Design a protein around this motif. Sequence first.
Motif, short mmCIF file in Angstrom:
data_model
loop_
_atom_site.label_atom_id
_atom_site.label_comp_id
_atom_site.label_asym_id
_atom_site.label_seq_id
_atom_site.Cartn_x
_atom_site.Cartn_y
_atom_site.Cartn_z
N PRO A 46 0.82 -1.03 0.04
CA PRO A 46 0.02 -0.03 0.01
C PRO A 46 0.60 1.36 -0.03
CG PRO A 46 0.07 -1.01 2.05
CD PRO A 46 0.62 -1.84 1.23
N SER A 47 2.08 1.05 0.22
CA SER A 47 2.93 2.46 0.22
C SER A 47 4.02 2.49 -0.94
CB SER A 47 3.67 2.42 1.87
OG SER A 47 4.39 1.22 1.83
N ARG A 48 3.70 1.74 -1.97
CA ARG A 48 4.76 1.52 -3.14
C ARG A 48 4.62 2.78 -3.81
NH1 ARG A 48 5.40 -3.71 -4.04
NH2 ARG A 48 7.41 -3.99 -3.58
N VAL A 49 5.69 3.29 -4.25
CA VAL A 49 5.68 4.57 -5.20
C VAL A 49 6.42 3.80 -6.53
CG1 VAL A 49 6.81 6.88 -5.76
CG2 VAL A 49 6.54 6.15 -3.33
N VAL A 50 5.15 3.84 -7.49
CA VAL A 50 5.78 3.40 -8.81
C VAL A 50 5.93 4.26 -9.86
CG1 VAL A 50 4.47 1.68 -10.58
CG2 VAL A 50 4.13 1.46 -8.13
N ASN A 51 6.87 4.00 -10.82
CA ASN A 51 7.38 4.97 -11.94
C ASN A 51 7.07 3.96 -13.12
OD1 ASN A 51 8.17 7.72 -10.81
ND2 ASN A 51 9.36 5.99 -9.35
#
Length: 183
Positions: A46-51
């Motif tokens: 739930p806290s992933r930063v995705v690029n």
Amino acid sequence: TTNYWQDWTDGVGTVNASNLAGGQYSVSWTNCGNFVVGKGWSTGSPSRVVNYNAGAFSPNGNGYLSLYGWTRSPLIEYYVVDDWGSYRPTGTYMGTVTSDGGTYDIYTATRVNAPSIDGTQTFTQFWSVRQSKRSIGTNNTITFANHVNAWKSHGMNLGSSWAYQIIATEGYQSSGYANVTVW
């Protein structure tokens, strides 16, 4: 970096997907049924930063480009949709969330005895759908925690058991071309 490659199709029509190096993939399709192809992580967070950078996303008809994943207990299919083709996905309006330069409508929907990561099941979809299509060919961030926390505010709590979590190209009864790099 990514650890996971997803190459799911229902077998209808022709879908060719390529697991390229690192976080990059491509997919071409012609008169598909339903497919979900992409790269990401085998256990979502739930806290992933995705690029991602979609070198190309050219559906001819209905296709989506989304952060996409599943939780279990309860069974939830979720989307952060940044781009789409001829059809903008919607459901029951819950609010909006503003993140990474976009404003997203938030929707819920029930899928009754529908195809899922566990076969025929009744499950829920949580949607964040951008109000306008995000730029293609740019380095785009999805700060997923903003969506998770917006969803929580409307009672859309994700399940406790996380399945995969990918930047996904999804087609429905369409043709098209996509090339995407994820990190």
